[PDB]
Write a protein that binds this ligand. Structure first.
Ligand SMILES: [Mg+2]
Ligand SMILES: [Mg+2]
Ligand SMILES: [Mg+2]
Ligand SMILES: [Mg+2]
Lengths: 504, 513, 513, 503
């Protein structure tokens, strides 16, 4: 009943670690997360954002354990077992165990240019299977998760499904909502493809990786943690989180008949704050335009250095940074110290020298300069095509400016790149996550929940849940030529208006 | 050079008080503000909201002084004088000196039922004139505000105008915006009705009481202070405020030619957070439904007790609580103490006993039972392109629905006999139902060391809901309904059906889309 | 299982109110605590210290409930019952229900000059008996505290004893601890004078009002709350409190054999922070020298107004402020609004006019001028191994020194004519002048799943000063001395010379050693 | 007039960066500080203590600039120049630029076992001379710090002296205090060995590296920053810091006649909080006993791996981790990623495999176990105390082993005795507050004073320093409580038998 450890945490005060979760924390696979920054290169703009994936993972664990333990005590008819509490807890603890260095770059532009095979969710699942089948881990968890191969393997399957599964996405297939009760009961019964548990435990899928509306404990932890680290204020607070946890129940989904996590309708504004806070932290922190400029230098360095950096894998074979996802043991040797590996390399191949040049430009702040931005409604597109169209129209406009003002190709020779940021609440361009959250009325002590009225987002939210930012990165030389820089900024705005993305 | 006092403050750490602002703080008129709760009856739901008008006024002073002092150092060409800095600072310090007890009730339902003459802004102006003409204050301020009676009087006029004036409201009238630029200048030249300063100091009107967009330092202080006291998180933070103060300049308004306070365009999101935070604190804190129920009991007590409670005015005449606004001296004897004056009264007139009964209901938590609520778009109040009409129609439709429920379920009038009242709250961002304050804030581009712009029409479409205001409609019934949930649930069902049946709301859903 | 209310609190985030504690909160007697400032007149120096006794009492309740509920889950062999948990919780909630207005002045100088009979702990016990015997409260608590009159009466007796009892003070008497342990057990057996529970529940007496070492939840709450409201940093933090709650057990006292609350020995520094934080907040906040100056004006006003202010008691008899402690009903009409009652009085008796004059001096900041201070070891009060004697000797020596200064510098009696008063403050850790509270706290070793120990004599020697208490001696003169710094500086010099010349202090130095 | 950058900071909200301080921040030498943890291995106990030397250095800069700028505005008669403000600012920014990886281990046990040449203060001074003599830095600072070689070199000398100099230590030579005014004025005049400024600017030496009483802006920043990161509450708060900055003046030292930073006497409690907060964070955070256990594993790994890890220096020569302090360019390639260099090494030499074994024990939490501790007054004597306690414990365990017939089960137990110095700074006996000058009243030349001898008697324990003596055992004893209990009993009996502890 006493925790093995109580660990100081700056968001919650402390995190309690019960036996045998301590055995998962004290593995090389979990301790690796101390050497991955939660927010990647954001620290080059917000220097206090140097918090690790380790502290996020402990925080996320603490929330998943607290929420399932609260549900078990307030609704004994759910039949939540010690096994359900530990599986859901472990999924929360290990959801993030498979990030590479600078994960969003590693899985994004680096993976795209390199044809990389696996992304962090795939690697998480591989590392979870590796950790849970270690004999010194199985001997500690067997009394909770099962002594038989069948029982233990089902428990491990549930842990990986709580991360990877999307068991409610069928409910949004066209006309599922208008089907008769009969058809519906049968469809839900035969749609159930989860192996680790039956439909009677469907609500656990809302806790760890909530694909339906993004209201998972991972989200709640990183909003609070990343707000505190960045100093950017958000409406979702520690007190907001405690309000949700004091007003949470499992109810029947009126659309599927499955058990779902619901909140008291008096908390709808508190749930809306989760999506609004996500979009705010994306706009101000994670996709800050100077962070984006430095990401382009880091991706070039990783691509140029990638063949030369080698990691020993399972069978003593060496894997390059470009192939490390092909072997879990080699992958586990990678950290954010990849940056220092490049800087300290004694390899004199021209490509290594190019990678070192790019990293040294970051440290001297020799980065691209801002040549304008606008925000736009994703609907006015019908994002890569928008970027290509804006870049082509800007080039035409700069040619016309160059010839009309007789600048002898000074404008036509300017090097610039058009980039985009998706600034959303999660989910799709058009849907606020709050619209897809179930609520209950009254103070229950079986309850059927409801989704909000169509009026709620009309009265409280902008028409679209997502905006795109289109921005221009120029050669740093343009910093000393404001008259040229001003023409590129003018061209971006005219290209936006000429495509009907912006009104003048 | 050095402040006379440095006073601890929980929002900023400290407030610096330079000479001779200390002399205004140390007056009976300013010290009275210790005994007025900034958020009225909110403390009966949020018990930590017991902060005074005194701490808000010191905070608001500190921001006005910091902002004008920053502008004077950053933009010497503005010709900001010590007299402009002190007048703007004092207007910020004293803007709230004229509140009555439980101000929003005092100036709202109490004033309406009583036909009260003056509201807090009127009383502030009267008390400002009284403070600044005290011999012991004039002797301290004459060296800054003017050694001639005429000069001193002009400074006092400026202080009161920074609170009461609306010098930019002409810019929105007629089609002033479409007028030939030259005629615009002539109109602006002849519209200038401010006596205490010329149009070259127009930007000072943005600092204290900003009628054009509500972005004054009074608003910035209360959002931070009321958020911290309530525990309700908002996007406008102390760091947001410091960002605005590090990115503020005076620029020319492209629509009037007048000097205005502007912010860097990189801070547009930080400015939008002011209006969004105001609406959030109204929805969650100031117009909390249980606060509104207890306000109805407090107003009944004040109306019933009002004739019996007397305050000595100028020349020793007694004024009732219902007439105190007619004499500044009698008004200055009023505080939130009025609640204890009623409770402790030895008057046995039936009306005093009714006031005591109502206050004892608050203390025993004998308050109305919640019988449902909904939010609505103000536009849905009519079918053409009336909050009171919404309230009357909802109440009439609920009565009809409860009659049908009563007869269909054979409840022998137990539903039809339920007493309930329908109320509304206006939950807005500070201006009109349709306009986000951010649309009416001027910004600048680049890192200047001159002409501002208003946001594109796209900004509100991409970032804000269609309407800046929402209405909440809610039902209060007899407290006894707490012990009869089956009956209470029918009334809550009737409110939802009534909203839908009058086209005020569309229903809660069985699927997202 | 579910709380009736969850109430926002700025120290803990929230306080959970289980049924039927909500019924005690919603009484006129508990709601009165909204209108008593927790730190009295401190707000005239620290304007954010306007938090009420109501918020402190809810916080204190929340800690007592959490601690006893944690002990019941961690140590089922203690046989903690629902009745023990609710009695201890209620004692914590209501310990502070009996404070008067400006309690420390009311029970201190006002009571001394007036010969007042009862102090706040006496009134708390009277008000607790009144609340728990209300028919609408007994109907809610009878199912937990007892369905027979005898059982209910025993529960109410336990609630009052957890506040007033001192069951461990015998352990320090005589040479009790050198006694043969057999005789010790029989003495402890026959010393047990508590009626509401047996000695098997002795550990509950450490929770609410801890006379033995002051480590009660009331102390833990006010240190956190008063630190946050004042902005004065202390070592005892919210995280320190959670550390104690995660490392707390009931063990056997090795000196008495009674069950006592103990902490893990790894938390000894966290416990020492409680007494050190108390002394710091006394020195910096509660006994701030400008607060003490304004207290002298407030006590004079209360004494002068006291006969004229009347409160209706049981059977409709009127009690003056000087007699209100003689009738619980009359006492319950008093709040901090007594200050406004004086200010607004229409009585023209010269004594009422004197009270109004004193309160107007506070509002205009017409307070005494500081004319020096020093700190001293209480041991230096006599030459053998008398705060009043220190104060008399300092004042007499200063007078002689000022006479010599006046004649030597030919100031024609301008120094000799200065009016001043010498005062003292006791700045201690809560027990006696010589004992650090931590020395009297039991600890345990290891991670048990039984006999505690007191700290080694080395702990205090290595970590604490020799004395747990210091005295501050300070001088208050006429406010006019603010405008005559050359005279003021001579008086400050005289205080330092007077302290040195009486061997109360050694002088400020020209080199560290 | 406007800062070039305003950078978010979790302690102050923001740090303003004026031109041309931005040019020093945007160097590889300063950016390296992002990859050195301020608190070393503390994060293995307090996982939120992962803040870098970079954020501490920016904070320390911001305080030094604010304090000297405030003094310049409040006391124009000090003749503080733009050059004094920028030299003092830069010394504060760069004081910490020369730490190695896991600095306290690197300069402590690693250096002792390796005979390492230089410590971090020496390397700071080398790196400051390298940065300030870069042509693209000199071209930016020449207009403030001097266009002539002589002027520029004087300014660079002042920056390095504000870090290394101890110009007031002569004031504590026996009998200096009792000398006549004549002798004193002459002694102070001829003791002045600072080259970068004259004695009229002595007060600047109190700002950056305060060797007299430790009341420098470096100390004030790390107490606030490390308290916030650790979640360990202290009496020194951000509001305490603002109180000091609102009540600070330069006054004449009554003992030397030199100008010194002084605080209003109403702030004596607020100054005492600095030393008390330092001792608290040492006891609870920096010298946490589990941190110490993991330090012994990390030192062994660094010693075993040190010959194999190589860094390219100035002339393309390779320097081992054990020699990197011999070449500033090789030193600048070192970071906390040395831990990952060991873990990922393909070298199969037995010593490299031993280093990897030790680091993998840290990650699996296979660390020594606690076998007791006590606190002691240093006057009852630290290396000798550790050796005596270990020898007496060994004798006591032999007597226990034979008397209880345990056939050498006690005598075979492997354990190590360690010590921690838990102090307020300075010496075992002196509270820093006793050595701080204060002033009286509200001045607008003032002579300051030191506190009465009574102040520490009434407010502080008799000694300013305590020692903690503790035992680390083989992790096997975690499963042998009866054996572990005898070692704990032996430590206590050894303390009592040497009169360090009383019954
Ligand atoms: Mg441990
Ligand atoms: Mg003062
Ligand atoms: Mg309620
Ligand atoms: Mg920039």
């Amino acid at each position: 009943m006493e925790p093995k450890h109580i660990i100081n945490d700056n968001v919650y005060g402390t995190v309690k670690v019960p036996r045998p979760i301590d055995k998962l924390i004290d593995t090389v696979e979990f301790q690796r997360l101390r050497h991955l920054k939660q927010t990647g290169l954001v620290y080059l703009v917000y220097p206090n954002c140097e918090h690790s994936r380790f502290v996020h993972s402990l925080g996320t664990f603490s929330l998943a354990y607290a929420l399932v333990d609260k549900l078990r005590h307030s609704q004994p008819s759910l039949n939540i077992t010690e096994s359900d509490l530990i599986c859901t807890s472990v999924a929360a603890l290990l959801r993030n165990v498979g990030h590479g260095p600078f994960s969003h770059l590693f899985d994004g532009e680096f993976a795209k240019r390199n044809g990389s095979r696996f992304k962090h969710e795939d690697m998480s699942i591989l590392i979870i299977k590796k950790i849970m089948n270690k004999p010194e881990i199985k001997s500690e968890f067997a009394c909770i998760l099962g002594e038989t191969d069948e029982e233990y393997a089902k428990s491990v399957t549930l842990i990986t499904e709580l991360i990877s599964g999307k068991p409610f996405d069928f409910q949004d297939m066209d006309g599922f909502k208008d089907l008769p009760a009969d058809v519906r009961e049968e469809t839900v019964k035969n749609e159930w493809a989860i192996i680790g548990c039956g439909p009677e435990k469907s609500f656990l899928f809302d806790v760890v990786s909530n694909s339906y509306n993004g209201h998972d404990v991972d989200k709640m932890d990183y909003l609070l943690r990343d707000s505190k680290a960045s100093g950017v204020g958000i409406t979702f607070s520690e007190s907001t989180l405690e309000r949700l946890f004091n007003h949470v129940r499992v109810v029947i989904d009126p659309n599927s008949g499955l058990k779902r996590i619901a909140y008291s309708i008096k908390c709808i504004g508190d749930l809306k704050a989760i999506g609004d806070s996500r979009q705010e932290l994306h706009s101000k922190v994670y996709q800050h335009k100077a962070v984006r400029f430095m990401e382009t230098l880091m991706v070039d360095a990783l691509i140029n250095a990638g063949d030369f950096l080698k990691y020993k894998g399972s069978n003593g074979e060496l894997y390059s940074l470009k192939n490390v996802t092909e072997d879990v043991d080699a992958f586990l040797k990678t950290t954010d110290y990849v940056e220092q590996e490049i800087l300290n390399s004694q390899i004199t191949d021209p490509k290594m020298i190019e990678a070192q040049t790019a990293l040294l430009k970051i440290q001297r702040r020799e980065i691209g300069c801002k040549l304008g931005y606008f925000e736009m409604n994703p609907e006015n597109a019908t994002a890569a095509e928008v970027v290509k169209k804006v870049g082509q129209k800007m080039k035409e406009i700069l040619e016309q400016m160059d010839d009309t003002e007789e600048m002898d190709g000074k404008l036509k020779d300017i090097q610039f790149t058009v980039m985009h940021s998706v600034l959303g609440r999660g989910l799709d361009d058009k849907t606020h996550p709050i619209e897809r959250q179930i609520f209950y009325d009254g103070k229950p002590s079986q309850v059927v929940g409801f989704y909000p009225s169509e009026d709620y987002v009309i009265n409280n939210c902008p028409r679209m849940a997502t905006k795109w930012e289109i921005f221009v990165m120029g050669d740093r030389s343009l910093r000393k030529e404001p008259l040229l820089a001003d023409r590129v900024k003018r061209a971006l705005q005219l290209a936006g208006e000429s495509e009907k993305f912006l009104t003048p």
